[PDB]
Subunit: 458 residues, 4 copies
Amino acid sequence: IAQHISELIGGTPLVRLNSVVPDGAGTVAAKVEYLNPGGSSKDRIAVKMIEAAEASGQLKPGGTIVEPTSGNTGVGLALVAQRRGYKCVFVCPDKVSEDKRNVLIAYGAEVVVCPTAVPPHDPASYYSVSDRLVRDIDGAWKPDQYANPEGPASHYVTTGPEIWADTEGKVTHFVAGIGTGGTITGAGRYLKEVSGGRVRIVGADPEGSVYSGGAGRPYLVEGVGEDFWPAAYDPSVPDEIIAVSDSDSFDMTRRLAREEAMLVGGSCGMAVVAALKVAEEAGPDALIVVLLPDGGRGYMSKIFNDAWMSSYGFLRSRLDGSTEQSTVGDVLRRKSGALPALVHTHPSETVRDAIGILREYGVSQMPVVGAEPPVMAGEVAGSVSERELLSAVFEGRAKLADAVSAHMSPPLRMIGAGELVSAAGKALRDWDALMVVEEGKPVGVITRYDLLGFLSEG
Amino acid sequence: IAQHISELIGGTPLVRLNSVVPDGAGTVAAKVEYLNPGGSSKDRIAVKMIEAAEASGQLKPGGTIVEPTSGNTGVGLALVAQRRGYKCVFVCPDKVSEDKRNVLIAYGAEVVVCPTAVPPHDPASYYSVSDRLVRDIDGAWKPDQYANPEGPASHYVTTGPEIWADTEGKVTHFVAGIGTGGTITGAGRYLKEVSGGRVRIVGADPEGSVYSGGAGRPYLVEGVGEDFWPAAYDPSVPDEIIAVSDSDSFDMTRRLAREEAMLVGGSCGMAVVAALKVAEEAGPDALIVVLLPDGGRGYMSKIFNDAWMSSYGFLRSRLDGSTEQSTVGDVLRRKSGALPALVHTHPSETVRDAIGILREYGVSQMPVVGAEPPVMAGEVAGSVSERELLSAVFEGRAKLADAVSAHMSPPLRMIGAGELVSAAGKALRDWDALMVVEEGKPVGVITRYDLLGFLSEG
Amino acid sequence: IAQHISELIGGTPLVRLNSVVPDGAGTVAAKVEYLNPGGSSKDRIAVKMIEAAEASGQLKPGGTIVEPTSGNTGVGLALVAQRRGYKCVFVCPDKVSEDKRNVLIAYGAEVVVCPTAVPPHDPASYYSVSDRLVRDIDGAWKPDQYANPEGPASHYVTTGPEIWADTEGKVTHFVAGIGTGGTITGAGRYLKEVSGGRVRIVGADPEGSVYSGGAGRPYLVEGVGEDFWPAAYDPSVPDEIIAVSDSDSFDMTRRLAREEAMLVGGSCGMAVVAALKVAEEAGPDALIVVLLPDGGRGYMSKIFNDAWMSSYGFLRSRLDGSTEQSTVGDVLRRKSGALPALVHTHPSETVRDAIGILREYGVSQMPVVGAEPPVMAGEVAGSVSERELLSAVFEGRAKLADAVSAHMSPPLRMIGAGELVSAAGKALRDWDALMVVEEGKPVGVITRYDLLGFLSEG
Amino acid sequence: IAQHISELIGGTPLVRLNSVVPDGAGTVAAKVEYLNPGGSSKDRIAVKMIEAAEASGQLKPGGTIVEPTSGNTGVGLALVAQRRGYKCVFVCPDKVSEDKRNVLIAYGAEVVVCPTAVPPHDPASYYSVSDRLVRDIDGAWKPDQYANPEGPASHYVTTGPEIWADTEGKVTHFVAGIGTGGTITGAGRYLKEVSGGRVRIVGADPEGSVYSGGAGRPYLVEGVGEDFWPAAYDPSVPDEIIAVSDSDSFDMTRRLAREEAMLVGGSCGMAVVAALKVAEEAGPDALIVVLLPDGGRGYMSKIFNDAWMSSYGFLRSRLDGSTEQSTVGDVLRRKSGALPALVHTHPSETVRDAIGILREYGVSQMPVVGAEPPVMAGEVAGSVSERELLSAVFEGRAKLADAVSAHMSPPLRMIGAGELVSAAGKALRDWDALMVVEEGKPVGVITRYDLLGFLSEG
Ligand SMILES: Cc1ncc(COP(=O)(O)O)c(CN[C@@H](CO)C(=O)O)c1O
Ligand SMILES: Cc1ncc(COP(=O)(O)O)c(CN[C@@H](CO)C(=O)O)c1O
Ligand SMILES: Cc1ncc(COP(=O)(O)O)c(CN[C@@H](CO)C(=O)O)c1O
Ligand SMILES: Cc1ncc(COP(=O)(O)O)c(CN[C@@H](CO)C(=O)O)c1O
């Protein structure tokens, strides 16, 4: 029946969370947005924008759209353009993980994307190339949802009224994953008029953000957060903005996924946790309507990955649930089956020999013993690093001909072998290395660098 | 309003393809299945099967589901189980690309998967471990959609009737992506009864498949195809099965994606091409209803990737559309802009020296000249491979002390330097190597192995 | 007492070989030349030539010597020049052993050496740079012992007369390591005059040499052999030249070293074998005087090395004497200690997958089995190489989508695991690879290339 | 004439140094010992000891010699044994230059050598295996020149009397390379008796040695020096021992080689410098007799090598004489002529990203700038090492989510690009790294570790 796929955007259903809402609180339903053809709630802002531009006249037939497509934007924008038969050229933060720009290309959109994080002030960055293309090409258009009233108008038309119709105006508080504006600005501006002041418009934003009255910071939840107040936003709409920490967002997303079957992204998790928190000041009998405008399936590379979420130092439970042993043993090899080798420098060898052996085996810490490595029973005397000798060879306090036995540092303390990594790092907090002994024999050396590399590798 | 996310499965919309249907043919609409909460059309089978099992009694509350989850099954099955609060244990073909099992775990399903392609006949394979777990665990259940009448029952209940309601019974031919059966069987068995013989039930299956009366073969479109006739299928339902080639399937998928904004998987492309072909024997005024029960977003790793689709030797157009130059130059380096000294071997050096130099530079073909490499003007005389000498050192027809100048093979022919890779391979069809000359000087050597490696690397 | 070190050249002693002379033959004494200050018998030519040049006038005080120093020439020539206080500039085969040019530099001789084996015909080669320097520098001199009568005159003065004095003219046959001439010419021209025709002047030269009436060939015994007859040689002096094979020369050198304590070079071994052979036609009571004008200590890198003498395919006994087990086991690893599983490709995987897996593990031959690698009991069916598929992918007789099970070559035969390498190669003469089974299981694959690499590595 | 090669040991000539003696000092002649058949002065001790043992009775015919062979011992010992037809088994300190044990094997001596520097106190070391073999094998003998009066007896018989005969007792002072004592003890004990007190017996020993009344230390001149007073030495013989520094020994050896054509080892250089110094307290008209009992040709690997003598931090002139600056440019690559990227980590990327990028490119110091690397003009603001972040990630003073712009260390100072390495290290003495700018742009980073690695690699 539908004339085109684009005419299925909207009418997103509502679900009732049952495991993410502590007992005794009112119903907290969620509006999922990944059921739309574009896979993201943004395709709505897209269609409206395209309709408005076509009705305006500044975009003649046969023109070319151009703007920095963060990623999901190209989705809806290219969808609409292909529906009507337009072109799509995207110049955005190179960030776009390979998958993002691969998908954007798949929808028939030429990309000349340029690296981000570099303030151009000249044609030497992503916004630089974007502006250069805008100046160059004819019949183009810079939608720039950041500053476009039609953006929020879209939501004011068919983003909040749908919520009212589904809930029949029986919604106490509407939280939203604040961003450029739209969703929040439009949803609040609509829900407030039809209910006077009966509804509170909450706003979720990662801590340390401008919307929360803080300072700048890097971002890990794509789409949310910003540093310069976009002209398409007005705080007068929201009642009070509630901040949320990143560490409590990804964990919330994983929880929600395992307990309510919502493979949503990160912004959805942030909104969910925010809403949850809001659900306390309002007593029971209240209906909280949260929004999850990101279906997380391309996010499965990192957010649900056990490594990427471990590099940033927050993973409160492994995906499989059950915590597992991660003995330093495998951590000590990461390639060897039994063990790599207890590299040692007998205390009679020359300092140059020790420095060379360290430079050849790629280590920055090594014990020095008298007898052979294997037979050693933990009586090692010397403990030579790599930075100390390098700082002593030039400081005149040593000479290559000198024997290492007169410059060895105090023997670095040893720790367990089968112990969990967690304790290993906890102990590493007070020392820059340690000697792992295998059942009672010095078997290897562990340094913070290696532990971090192992934990981040996967 | 919805009690749970699972209660949004069904009611998939219909779209009208406008660029994949040659003019003059009747309307060929498609039913997309990736708008469901599970992201795949299989979740409907999941819900029906779970309902039937619960109503039966063989799955008591607090039990545990267990079966080989191809990948998307893990989606719907775990969705339903989490809705009702069950467990999920999957033992399937290790195939499941990292993303597949990562997503399955994300939905809270313990996986003890096992490698596939190995006929166990004992506890040594994926089905082996599946059967062992089935025998071991209590309160379990082996759904095995392959043999479950309730599977096709679901399609017969709420998979075809929806099509009839949307089209009001005005559907000439219904093509489907025949798989373990389901849709192909349920949809036909329903549509036929309400329309007598007014509707033809077409079936799409990759060539060289049992459903098409052929021989076994590997698979590249997950879900489709099979070798042993599943007990849950009956060919008496379909009117006539139409086969399709793999090479014309992925290309069709990419085409459909770029021309109708349908980021569907591969099986969808196969079904689309099938119907497309069927749309000829039936004249205009006919209404065709194709099915695309796979939303391709996790497929973006390979199907829309420019490399994976190139390793299998079929890519009729690069994703960006415009064909690009891929001269042997970069192909000759893969790691450099200049050029590693065209590994040479003066015809006076000993054969042992040449074999050693080849073994050290990792090459299997090298020209031998008199003067220095750079100044050479294409008068190279010798052309020594690596297999010939190895076959001559042991065949008594040569000795290490011998000079290479008495065993060099005829000088291998040279080709262009800036020429496209396509011509390079076309010419390589008649020789096992060639000497690429850079503007008029022998610069490198190209062998089929290196060309394939370059084309498959990306 | 000696005014300078150079005045100790000459008066080399004579020794009696007792283990290199089969019983029943006459005494065969040897004149060692490595007891001179220069370490080589050539220094005598150096001193004579320098004396002649100084007495002539074409080399004024403060001049500069220049000529291509094969290696030991740099010894005596620089010795004399430093004695009198001259300079030394050497342009010769760059392939002059590293140790060789290091030693030459140590004696205070600037080297601008150039690569050899390249016929310059222009300023692009070792002789090219030598001639350019000769033309450029003033007060220079090109000794070029190749064409200098004073060279042989040196021997005629104080190289043969010493032999006569030591033996009192009681020498039947004098063999010598014929080279640029010198000893072979001077010694004979002197010994013949004082004994009429009582002494036969034998000449030793590696087979396939111009001096032996043969064809050109590469050289492995530095100093001996040549292709163009030097103008400083006259065959009318020698009685009859006897050729010798290289394979019987190095072995003779090692034998002599172990049985007579003569750490001499290779030319010495060739001369020794020559005389040894000559000692048969002449009955007992004859006194043979061989010459060993090369003390082999810098030759200990290769000649006495167990690897370099193995790369050229002749080593009739290991240095330690006792033959040792090699076993393909270690030959199968060459790294770590245990065999890395076994590259396997199940016969259901796609051909592209097999080619990629071969390209990633760096192998050119692999068996294909049904079950897992370890449990396999030698029932492997497929045997796919790397050249066959590459020749079949382009020959139209296969396609990447095709299954490897329809193109596998006949399963390559297996051999023993603990067997000696000797038998391994002997069997490899009839096949290009084999499957090494470890106690009854296919453990690895062995190819001629790997065996040669192992034997040449050491 | 000679019955065997061993009967040429002795009668070493004397030479007059002309460039290593200061004008105005008396003649300082040297006795070279590398003209003997064994190549070392030790062979004389070998012959004497073998004669004594044979005449004693504790070594019956058909026995087996066994003792720890340093490097030249096996030479003479095996020479004598092969002359008489004995066996040779050597268990000595490991490290023995590969060449050393290769040569020892060449003379037909089985070696079961064991690692050194490990105090066994059990069969776990070189002396351990030596003692075990001595206990095990029958008909053996432990010569142990360390404690054998016949050792010094040899020198007393035919090591000093030869000096007296050559100089006719006209020798003022005899310096010697004191080692186990044998040489010096015998020479002094003989020369003193025939001249009363007319001759001073000087002794040369590297500084920081027991013979010089100092403390223990590693050794770099093989043969000289010792820690425990050998029982075969008596200081009552020498008049006064003069010490010498290692740094002034190798340089003296190289000087002597270039200026007097004496390719002697290191101990010879030490003795020469000793005598040289002694030649001052004694006025002109004095005749000094130095000893060089080591012909350095196997030492050409390191002593005359430009790298090994550079690793130990003393090389006062390159072998070729002319100094040639080694600009940091090549030092900054060691892989090519162009620096391969420096850093693009702008002060906005996350700390985890920076640590990962450092861990991937193998660096411990990197600048952080705003714009692109190339266009940068030296306005870099951040300077992040690798140890600081690792010490801040665990110290609670930072978190992975934090931005690096709040933890960057003060920007490390820059230095020149074409400047000589010497100045580079001199400046590095005050900092642990620097930023090398290429003509005015930051091109790379230099750290002490890299400089040392470059200087030691060669
Ligand atoms: C999950 C998620 N939630 C919300 C937003 C922004 O919408 P808002 O400003 O109404 O919050 C985004 C941004 N994504 C949009 C930008 O608005 C895009 O064009 O791709 C998002 O990815
Ligand atoms: C695109 C597509 N179309 C159809 C099917 C199978 O459904 P059918 O047997 O009714 O054809 C699959 C298999 N996918 C299902 C198996 O039925 C799964 O559990 O993941 C599929 O991926
Ligand atoms: C062992 C041996 N025997 C002989 C010769 C040449 O001397 P001849 O020409 O008198 O035979 C050489 C060459 N070595 C000389 C070249 O004459 C050199 O300058 O190094 C040699 O190495
Ligand atoms: C240059 C030099 N000078 C002297 C000695 C020892 O002799 P001495 O103890 O008489 O001094 C050595 C040791 N070299 C002997 C050990 O005596 C060896 O067997 O190799 C030496 O290398």
